[PDB]
């Protein structure tokens, strides 16, 4: 795996 958490992993 996970680079961006939450909104950033979209």
């Amino acid at each position: 795996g996970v680079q961006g958490s939450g909104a950033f992993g979209r």
């Epitope: 996970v2 680079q3 961006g4 958490s5 939450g6 992993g9």
Partner: antibody, heavy 117, light 112 residues
Framework: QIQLVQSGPELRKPGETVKISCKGS????????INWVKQTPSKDLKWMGW????????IYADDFKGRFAFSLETSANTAYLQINNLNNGDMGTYFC??????????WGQGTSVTVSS | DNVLTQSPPSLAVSLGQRATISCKAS??????????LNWYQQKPGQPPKFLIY???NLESGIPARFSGSGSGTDFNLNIHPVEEEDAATYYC?????????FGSGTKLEIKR
């Protein structure tokens, strides 16, 4: 046995610079983002932004745009936070955290920063 | 920003009883079927501890005495039975938008 371990407490005079490390172990470091979180003296939690550990690209929260820099030394499995031109408002504890799909799962232990002459 | 308001600021609960902590968001955190809202537990001297994600999903390794509910703007953390180890500050956090925001926390005190 996964952990994030940060560097120790730091004291600086106003106007100086601090660089703080966060070393990840027990997993592939370049596969997970690192977020930075400030805890103020009054204990408020503020998200500062994050760094993509594969591309090296940082994103800063609007509150942390200017004097704050996220960097990497991936051969050390380490992310850094640098704070330039320190003022009294930068006092607090700084945490690195690993990105999770929804949350922030693994946390470093905190690095306190004291600003004093 | 999406401002998270928690209540009460603190509370005292007798051992074995239920603690209920509320988190209210100024913007909906719903995206594609999921609520992007997480709960942490913090003890002084320690980092926050990841308890619950996506409103109601317990992080692996966390006791099932902790449970979360809600969607949209209105969320609750429930702790039952309250235990000695549960004295801490509890924070909600949204990840639906930049910047991520935390509530200012609810301190749980234990009565014995």
């Amino acid at each position: 046995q996964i952990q994030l371990v940060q560097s120790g407490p730091e004291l600086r005079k106003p106007g100086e610079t601090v660089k703080i490390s966060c070393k990840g172990s027990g997993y592939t470091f370049t596969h997970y983002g690192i977020n930075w979180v400030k805890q103020t003296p009054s204990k408020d939690l503020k998200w500062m932004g994050w760094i993509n550990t594969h591309t090296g690209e940082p994103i800063y929260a609007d509150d942390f745009k200017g004097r704050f820099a996220f960097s990497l030394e991936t051969s050390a499995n380490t992310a850094y936070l640098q704070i330039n031109n320190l003022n009294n408002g930068d006092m607090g504890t700084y945490f690195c955290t690993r990105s999770h799909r929804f949350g922030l799962d693994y946390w470093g232990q905190g690095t306190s920063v004291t600003v004093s002459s | 920003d999406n401002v998270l308001t928690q209540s009460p600021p603190s509370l005292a609960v007798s051992l074995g009883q239920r603690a209920t902590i509320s988190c209210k968001a100024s913007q909906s955190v719903d995206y594609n079927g999921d609520s992007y809202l997480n709960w942490y537990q913090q003890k002084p001297g320690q980092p926050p501890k990841f308890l619950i994600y996506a409103a109601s999903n317990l992080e692996s390794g966390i006791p099932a005495r902790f449970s979360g509910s809600g969607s949209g703007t209105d969320f609750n953390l429930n702790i039952h039975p309250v235990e000695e180890e549960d004295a801490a500050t509890y924070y909600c956090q949204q990840s639906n938008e930049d910047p991520f925001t935390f509530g200012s926390g609810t301190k749980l005190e234990i009565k014995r």
